[PDB]
Amino acid sequence: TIKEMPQPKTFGELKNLPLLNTDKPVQALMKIADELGEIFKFEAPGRVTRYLSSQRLIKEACDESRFDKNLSQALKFVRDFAGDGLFTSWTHEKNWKKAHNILLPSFSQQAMKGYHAMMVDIAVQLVQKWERLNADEHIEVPEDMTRLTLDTIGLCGFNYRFNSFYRDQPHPFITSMVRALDEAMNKLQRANPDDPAYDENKRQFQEDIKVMNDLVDKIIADRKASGEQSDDLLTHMLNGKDPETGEPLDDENIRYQIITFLIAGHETTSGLLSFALYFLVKNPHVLQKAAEEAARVLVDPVPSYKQVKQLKYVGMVLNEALRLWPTAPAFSLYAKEDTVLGGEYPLEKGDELMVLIPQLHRDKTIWGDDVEEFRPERFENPSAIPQHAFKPFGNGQRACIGQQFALHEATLVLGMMLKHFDFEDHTNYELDIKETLTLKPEGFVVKAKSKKIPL
Ligand code: HEM
Ligand SMILES: CC(C)C1=CC2=CC[C@@H]3[C@](C)(CCC[C@@]3(C)C(=O)N[C@@H](Cc3c[nH]c4ccccc34)C(=O)O)[C@H]2CC1
Ligand SMILES: [Mg+2]
């Protein structure tokens, strides 16, 4: 039977638009999903989308014969500086499939063996920072995790050191990138974007785009000039040819890919590490089990690629953190053709869906009644998880190309953190999830007591 779709409260001619005029729109949409269920319509002047929350419907949304990736307005604003890089391109753009084919082998699990040493370089810098704190000091967790992930992507992406652990004020590139991302997200809630109050925003935005383009174009040009071969993604992109077209990426698209790796990877990955450490300090028995694994496996001063692969419980901790607070919390799809969703909701060609990942990850028909509990052991037998129940890295050919990189990074770093320190939730921190591009536990702080194990 065709079913009428629920809709949240309306504001006359503004329809549902004012519901997203909030500091925490994803958390607001999760509460609407709690009230309305697995699907609801969201209307604004000149647009409609449908928010999906159940595995039953998201399994169908994930059918690539029926639905393709849509660029959300969020992605369209980011496209002003990420261009036709992989994250902000339509599947049908020539540069999407070309870059996908060229870059997939450079992002495989096997390829992580080549990035491992660079990841260890930055991870050791984090450990040494914390070893060097005085008794009276604490750790700003998301702040340090972001220094780590930015620097790791910079070193593995284009052999560039942002030297974030040497600074209070980030490298100008990072200052410009973070300010451009802030501006792109701020434009989602901006009613009068041509008001003169935004003249400075528009000028600063063009300045920040030029800062990013100028540095990355220079490093590409420096690399081509020198002929130097490194273990970075820039080497792979300069050397690569798409088997289909037989073409390489041009220098402009290479620049957009480098900017994209930093944008797509830095705050998702640092949020994952921040939420994982938050859940560990709030669940001491889970922290103890993860710390026992780190001590048994990481028997050398420097972790190896093989040792990171044997941090199985650490991997389960990270998957459980992605279950509860996936740091890229939504993605957008469009209907390729007229179709019926779930035997109940007719859609026309071009109709849009939003996947509300945190709500999917709370589907009690999949996970059971204990969905709010942090229980990594629920990932012990993953073959038992029904299709499309767990989607922190998106879907299909448009899924996260960085998934293996992010998880190798996060497993290495969390393993080293748990080997080298005991952690104290010294403030009894109250979770406050700040929403920007990403989700993070705002103001999460801990104290780290060294186990005095040499590097
Ligand atoms: C260094 C780390 C990372 C890099 C370099 C990276 C890179 C990318 C790229 C290039 C894409 C676009 C793939 C394509 O469409 O061809 C993508 C998509 C995505 N990534 Fe990542 N990523 C990273 C980490 C993460 C993390 C940690 C998460 C989540 C916790 C995440 C979630 C996603 C999601 C959900 C998409 C799909 C977006 C959509 O459907 O619109 N990424 N990533
Ligand atoms: C760039 C990547 C990393 C991101 C992807 C995102 C996808 C969905 C977003 C997002 C979570 C930010 C908050 C709004 C939300 C949930 C959304 O539905 N947004 C819809 C609907 C919408 C909200 N405000 C709008 C204003 C104009 C047009 C559409 C909208 C949209 O962006 O399309 C946002 C975070 C950043
Ligand atoms: Mg506020």
For the chain, the structural domain boundaries read: 1-455
Ligand 1 pocket residue status of 400, Cβ below 6 Å: yes
- For ligand 1, mutation pick of 67, 86, 108, 400 (most atoms within 8 Å of CB): 400
* Alpha carbons 222 and 160: distance in angstroms, whole number: 12
CB-based contacts of 33, cutoff 8 Å, min separation 6: 40, 51, 53, 356, 359
Strand-strand pairing, 47-52 and 352-356: parallel
HSE-up of residue 178 (Cα within 13 Å, Cβ side): 13
Clarify whether 156 is annotated catalytic.
no
Task: Name residue, tokens 């999460």.
Answer: 444
Q: Which ligand is nearest to the CA of 442?
A: 3
Residue 406: which of 282, 234, 276 has the closest Cα? Answer: 276
Dihedral angle of Cα 93, 94, 96, 100, to the nearest 10 degrees:
160
- Residue 356 CA to residue 57 CA, distance in Å, equals 11
Tokens of 36: 């309305």
Phi, psi of 330 (to 5 degrees): -150, 155
The atom of ligand 2 lying closest to the CA of 29 is: 16
- What Å distances lie between residue 95 and 40, 221, 270, 273, CA to CA? 34, 20, 28, 32
149 is catalytic: no
Which of 234, 268, 395, 409 is the pocket-test mutation for ligand 1 (most atoms within 8 Å of CB)? Answer: 268
| Residues paired with residue 422 on neighbouring β-strands, in sequence order | 449
Residue 107 Cβ < 6 Å to ligand 1: no
Residue with tokens 């998934």: 403
Q: Determine the topology of domain 1-455 in CATH.
A: Cytochrome p450 (1.10.630)
State yes or no: 198 annotated in a binding site: no
Ligand 3 centroid–CA 22 distance in Å is: 8
Q: What's the CA gap between 455 and 444, in Å, rounded?
A: 26
Length of the chain: 455
Are residues 314 and 414 in contact, defined by beta-carbon separation less than 8 angstroms?
Answer: yes
Q: What are 430's two structure tokens?
A: 């109250």
Distance between CA 49 and CA 353 in Å, rounded? 6
Could you say which ligand is closest to the alpha carbon of residue 333? 1
The angle subtended at Cα 63 by Cα 361 and Cα 384, nearest 5°, is: 45
Q: Amino acid letter at 333?
A: L
Measured between alpha carbons, how far is 384 from 71 in angstroms, rounded to an integer? 32
**422: its two tokens:** 């005991």
Q: Which residue's CA lies nearest to atom 32 of ligand 1? A: 393
Contact, 339 vs 347, CB < 8 A?
A: yes
Q: How many CB atoms neighbour CB 175 within 10 A?
A: 13
The three-point CA angle 398-402-405 to 5° equals 155
> What amino acid occupies position 391?
K
**Side chain identity at 163, as an amino acid letter?**
N
Determination technique used = X-ray
Q: Please calculate the CA angle 75-79-80 and round it to the nearest 5 degrees.
A: 130
Rounded CA-CA distance 292/309 in Å is 16
Report the alpha-carbon distance of residue 212 to residue 84 in Å, rounded: 15
How many whole angstroms separate alpha carbon 293 and alpha carbon 298? 8
Q: Which ligand is nearest to the CA of 271?
A: 1
Say what the resolution is, in angstroms: 1.2
Residue keyed to tokens 């509860």 = 324
Pocket lined around ligand 2, Cβ cut-off 6 Å: 20, 25-26, 47, 72-75, 78, 188, 328-330, 354, 437
Looking up tokens 């792979």 gives 236
> CB-hemisphere CA count at 13 Å for 48?
10
User: Residue by residue, what is the 3-state secondary structure of the chain?
Assistant: CCCCCCCCCCCHHHCCHHHHCCCCHHHHHHHHHHHHCCEEEEEECCEEEEEECCHHHHHHHCCCCCEEECCCHHHHHHHHHHCCCCCCCCCCCHHHHHHHHHHHHHHCCCCHHHHHHHHHHHHHHHHHHHHCCCCCCCEEHHHHHHHHHHHHHHHHHHCCCCCHHHCCCCCHHHHHHHHHHHHHHHHHHCCCCCCHHHHHHHHHHHHHHHHHHHHHHHHHHHHHHHCCCCCCHHHHHHHCCCCCCCCCCCHHHHHHHHHHHHHHHHHHHHHHHHHHHHHHHHCHHHHHHHHHHHHHHCCCCCCCHHHHHCCHHHHHHHHHHHHHCCCCCEEEEEECCCEEECCCEEECCCCEEEEEHHHHCCCHHHHCCCCCCCCHHHHCCHHHCCCCCCCCCCCHHHCCCCHHHHHHHHHHHHHHHHHHEEEECCCCCCCCEEECCCEEECCCEEEEEECCCCC
Contacts of 135 (CB under 8 A, 6+ apart): none
Q: Tell me the backbone φ, ψ of residue 345, rounded to 5 degrees.
A: -120, 95
Q: Is 393 among the residues known to form the active site?
A: yes
CA angle 449, 451, 454 (to 5 degrees): 125
Cα gap 386→374, rounded to integer Å: 20
Place of tokens 């001619």: 13
Verify whether ligand 1 is closer than 6 Å to residue 289 (CB atom).
Answer: no
Distance (Å) from CA 189 to ligand 1 centroid: 24
Counting from 1 in the atom list of ligand 2, the atom nearest the Cα of 51 is 18
How many angstroms does the Cα of residue 75 sit away from the middle of ligand 1?
A: 12
Q: Are 286 and 279 in contact (CB under 8 A)?
A: yes
